[PDB]
Amino acid sequence: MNYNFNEIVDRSNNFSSKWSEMEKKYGTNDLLPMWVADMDFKAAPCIIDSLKNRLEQEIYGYTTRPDSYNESIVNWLYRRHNWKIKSEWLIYSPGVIPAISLLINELTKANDKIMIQEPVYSPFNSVVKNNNRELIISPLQKLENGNYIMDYEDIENKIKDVKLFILCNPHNPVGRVWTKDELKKLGDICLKHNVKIISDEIHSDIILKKHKHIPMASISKEFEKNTITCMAPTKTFNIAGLQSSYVVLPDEKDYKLLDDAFTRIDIKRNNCFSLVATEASYNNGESWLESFLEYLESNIDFAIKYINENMPKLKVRKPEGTYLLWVDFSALGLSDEELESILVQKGKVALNQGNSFGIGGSGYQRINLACPRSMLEEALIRIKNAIN
Amino acid sequence: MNYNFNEIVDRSNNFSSKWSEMEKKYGTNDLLPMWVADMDFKAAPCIIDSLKNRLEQEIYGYTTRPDSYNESIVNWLYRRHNWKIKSEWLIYSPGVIPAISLLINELTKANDKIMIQEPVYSPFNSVVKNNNRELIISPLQKLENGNYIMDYEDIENKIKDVKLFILCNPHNPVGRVWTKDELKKLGDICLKHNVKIISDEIHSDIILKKHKHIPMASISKEFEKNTITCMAPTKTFNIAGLQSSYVVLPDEKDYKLLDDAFTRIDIKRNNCFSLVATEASYNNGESWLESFLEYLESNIDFAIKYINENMPKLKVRKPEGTYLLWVDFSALGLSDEELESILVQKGKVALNQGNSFGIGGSGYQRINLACPRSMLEEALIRIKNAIN
Numbered sequence: 001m002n003y004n005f006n007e008i009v010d011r012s013n014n015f016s017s018k019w020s021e022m023e024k025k026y027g028t029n030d031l032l033p034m035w036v037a038d039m040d041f042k043a044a045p046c047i048i049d050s051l052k053n054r055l056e057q058e059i060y061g062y063t064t065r066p067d068s069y070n071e072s073i074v075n076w077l078y079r080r081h082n083w084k085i086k087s088e089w090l091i092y093s094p095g096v097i098p099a100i101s102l103l104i105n106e107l108t109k110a111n112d113k114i115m116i117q118e119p120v121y122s123p124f125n126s127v128v129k130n131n132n133r134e135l136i137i138s139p140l141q142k143l144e145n146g147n148y149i150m151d152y153e154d155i156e157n158k159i160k161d162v163k164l165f166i167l168c169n170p171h172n173p174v175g176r177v178w179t180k181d182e183l184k185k186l187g188d189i190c191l192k193h194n195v196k197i198i199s200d201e202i203h204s205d206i207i208l209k210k211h212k213h214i215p216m217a218s219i220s221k222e223f224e225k226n227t228i229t230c231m232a233p234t235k236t237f238n239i240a241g242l243q244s245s246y247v248v249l250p251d252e253k254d255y256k257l258l259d260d261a262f263t264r265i266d267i268k269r270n271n272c273f274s275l276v277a278t279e280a281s282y283n284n285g286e287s288w289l290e291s292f293l294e295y296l297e298s299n300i301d302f303a304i305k306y307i308n309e310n311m312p313k314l315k316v317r318k319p320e321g322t323y324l325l326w327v328d329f330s331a332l333g334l335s336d337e338e339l340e341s342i343l344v345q346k347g348k349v350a351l352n353q354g355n356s357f358g359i360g361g362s363g364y365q366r367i368n369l370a371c372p373r374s375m376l377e378e379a380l381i382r383i384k385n386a387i388n
Numbered sequence: 389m390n391y392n393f394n395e396i397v398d399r400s401n402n403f404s405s406k407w408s409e410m411e412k413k414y415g416t417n418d419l420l421p422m423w424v425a426d427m428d429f430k431a432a433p434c435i436i437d438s439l440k441n442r443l444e445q446e447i448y449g450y451t452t453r454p455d456s457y458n459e460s461i462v463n464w465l466y467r468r469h470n471w472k473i474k475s476e477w478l479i480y481s482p483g484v485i486p487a488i489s490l491l492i493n494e495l496t497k498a499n500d501k502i503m504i505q506e507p508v509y510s511p512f513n514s515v516v517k518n519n520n521r522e523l524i525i526s527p528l529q530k531l532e533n534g535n536y537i538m539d540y541e542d543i544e545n546k547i548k549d550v551k552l553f554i555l556c557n558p559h560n561p562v563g564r565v566w567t568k569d570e571l572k573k574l575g576d577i578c579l580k581h582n583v584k585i586i587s588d589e590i591h592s593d594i595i596l597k598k599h600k601h602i603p604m605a606s607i608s609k610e611f612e613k614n615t616i617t618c619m620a621p622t623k624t625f626n627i628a629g630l631q632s633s634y635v636v637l638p639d640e641k642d643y644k645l646l647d648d649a650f651t652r653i654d655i656k657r658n659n660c661f662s663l664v665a666t667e668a669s670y671n672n673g674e675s676w677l678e679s680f681l682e683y684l685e686s687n688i689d690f691a692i693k694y695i696n697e698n699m700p701k702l703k704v705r706k707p708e709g710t711y712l713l714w715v716d717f718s719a720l721g722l723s724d725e726e727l728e729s730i731l732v733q734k735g736k737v738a739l740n741q742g743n744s745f746g747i748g749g750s751g752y753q754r755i756n757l758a759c760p761r762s763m764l765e766e767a768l769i770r771i772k773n774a775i776n
């Protein structure tokens with residue numbers, strides 16, 4: 001199946017933050033954007049048509065969540081991940097960080113310790129601080145072979161009095177898809193220390209060849225009981241603007257706490273478009289997704305070949321998942337400030353600064369590869385210009 | 389201008405809570421729905437076409453809020469209400485109650501007292517309780533002429549240590565459009581006792597002939613500084629399914645507190661459809677709104693004539709605003725439970741039970757008149773069957 005991912009789709013009129021909010025961040029908007037994790041691709045045709053059908057009803061009042069909605073999510077998790085859940089475990093949230101934010105408030109008290117692994121998605125750090133909890137960072141270990149693993153010894157050394165661990169699986173920005181054995185080793189630590197895991201698995205569908213997503217909660221019943229899982233159609237199908245995610249809570253007590261938190265802030269219903277797009281994506285979007293992954297892996301291979309051939313001082317490992325590339329610029333001898341400056345000023349390209357991801361980010365930049373080949377090539381040429 | 393409000397638009401396929409969620413509330417879904425406050429009318433043509441234009445871009449990623457969005461709001465409030473605000477005062481919220489819930493958490497501490505006037509929109513009561521604050525109720529006074537007013541003596545008597553007053557303007561369900569002098573008397577009390585006012589003005593556009601909405605914050609500079617205001621296009625234009633509302637905070641310290649609460653729960657962006665519909669509704673929807681208000685007032689006059697002629701034991705005062713009719717059934721001598729039973733079982737009609745609005749609701753039912761004349765007639769015939 002072919003969906004014309006090579007097509008240029010200008011988003012200058014698309015009310016896109018990727019294309020329109022670069023001034024606050026970079027000091028100008030006149031840059032090639034490769035930062036924000038959404039895609040410069042059209043949504044799957046089944047999504048577009050589900051929106052069309054809903055639009056053409058012409059009444060946009062309060063929206064009910066039919067059984068078919070959560071059924072689509074149960075069926076997806078089983079057929080894609082071999083993880084059987086119950087529809088009764090699912091809670092709607094407009095996004096992952098909102099859900100994690102309410103969980104932190106309900107599952108811990110002020111100044112309780114919460115652990116994350118850096119470098120990681122920057123909201124993980126801020127959500128803990130903005131809830132007045134104490135952030136404990138166990139940095140991932142970058143091995144001398146250039147790859148990242150969890151630092152299990154460090155996690156043990158820092159685990160005392162920790163109440164929650166936020167796991168990123170696949171891990172953004174480094175692109176790790178954790179193996180079952182890696183997950184088992186972490187989940188055993190947390191079981192032993194009575195630490196509940198919140199697993200952010202939003203990139204669960206964006207997995208490259210020869211890798212497989214394992215939901216942490218899927219590994220065993222003991223892990224299931226000790227893991228809360230956040231997933232969404234939004235990264236997979238490029239529908240973050242529609243606002244749809246879910247939380248899987250196999251423990252009733254946790255379910256009740258989160259449900260009651262959403263009741264307290266009165267955030268319960270999907271918007272009318274999110275509702276139909278989420279079901280359409282999971283029920284009909286598989287073919288588009290497989291095609292997208294083939295296109296993505298080709299972009300990834302192209303970018304790494306380009307960098308190794310044309311920018312050999314840069315260092316990059318191929319990600320196992322996500323569409324995000326994590327590139328080490330440190331051999332240039334520039335400070336993070338100097339590098340940010342040349343990329344913006346000389347390259348005229350917008351990448352996510354490594355240091356924004358916390359410990360272990362210095363010297364790196366994150367590049368979004370979910371864009372047409374031609375745009376990716378332009379981006380790489382601009383980076384080449386920046387550093388030469 | 390004519391928009392064919394007479395047209396039947398079956399919503400059995402429209403994922404509508406009004407048409408689809410009666411089972412949990414009433415015991416069956418086989419009822420004529422006149423309960424939930426959304427309309428059985430198509431959205432304005434300008435709103436449908438804005439949604440079509442956005443849909444046809446075919447990319448639905450993270451959405452930026454262009455200056456034109458808050459400009460449309462500022463211009464509406466001046467044109468319609470003669471209230472000049474600054475765009476810098478506006479905060480996005482997916483809904484009014486979410487905003488109020490965050491305001492309560494940030495402006496008060498646990499077990500602080502918050503005052504409301506019943507009977508009122510039931511989330512006013514629950515939002516205080518679900519935030520572990522203490523609810524103080526000053527019931528509206530029902531005068532011997534059948535009209536409602538504020539009980540200013542009661543408010544004074546119960547004011548000590550109240551931190552916040554949640555005002556509904558217009559007041560759902562009784563249909564009061566408070567006069568400037570009524571609002572001055574309240575706001576003077578609150579200023580005097582250092583009680584901040586949160587004014588829910590979501591029905592601010594749904595105003596009948598010979599009445600005028602007065603934003604509480606618009607009355608004086610001193611009231612502007614002591615009033616936070618929630619408004620939305622959703623009730624006005626029947627777009628609750630798109631999720632859009634705003635808060636007006638003229639005091640920068642209040643702005644910051646709410647801003648930071650939204651940051652804490654990571655709810656910052658409009659969904660892509662809400663963004664375009666809100667600007668379209670305010671910029672282009674005025675002619676539709678004036679036509680809808682003519683249609684509504686005719687429905688209201690028809691219903692009151694029908695009730696007075698055919699169900700003379702019932703008592704009803706014409707509302708000044710909202711599309712909601714507040715009808716007293718107490719002369720039938722039924723308990724609230726008995727009345728609900730006969731309306732559902734015998735009438736097969738779904739109204740909002742009066743007692744759900746708190747003190748002063750017993751014996752009443754609320755009827756939604758934002759529907760075609762034909763459907764309204766059918767609803768009144770069902771009610772007459774129920775009570776005979």
Ligand SMILES: *Cc1c(COP(=O)(O)O)cnc(C)c1O
Nearest residue numbers: 037095096097098121172200202
């Ligand atoms: C992009 C992203 C999210 C998105 O969070 P929302 O609150 O749904 O927008 C969450 N987690 C990770 C790891 C991400 O990369």
Ligand SMILES: *Cc1c(COP(=O)(O)O)cnc(C)c1O
Nearest residue numbers: 425483484485486509560588590
């Ligand atoms: C219907 C209604 C609302 C709607 O609140 P949201 O949280 O925006 O859905 C708010 N206030 C009043 C008085 C209402 O009648």
Ligand SMILES: [Cl-]
Nearest residue numbers: 311312313314
């Ligand atoms: Cl180089």
Ligand SMILES: [Cl-]
Nearest residue numbers: 531533535536
């Ligand atoms: Cl009077």
Ligand SMILES: [Cl-]
Nearest residue numbers: 699700701702
């Ligand atoms: Cl009668």
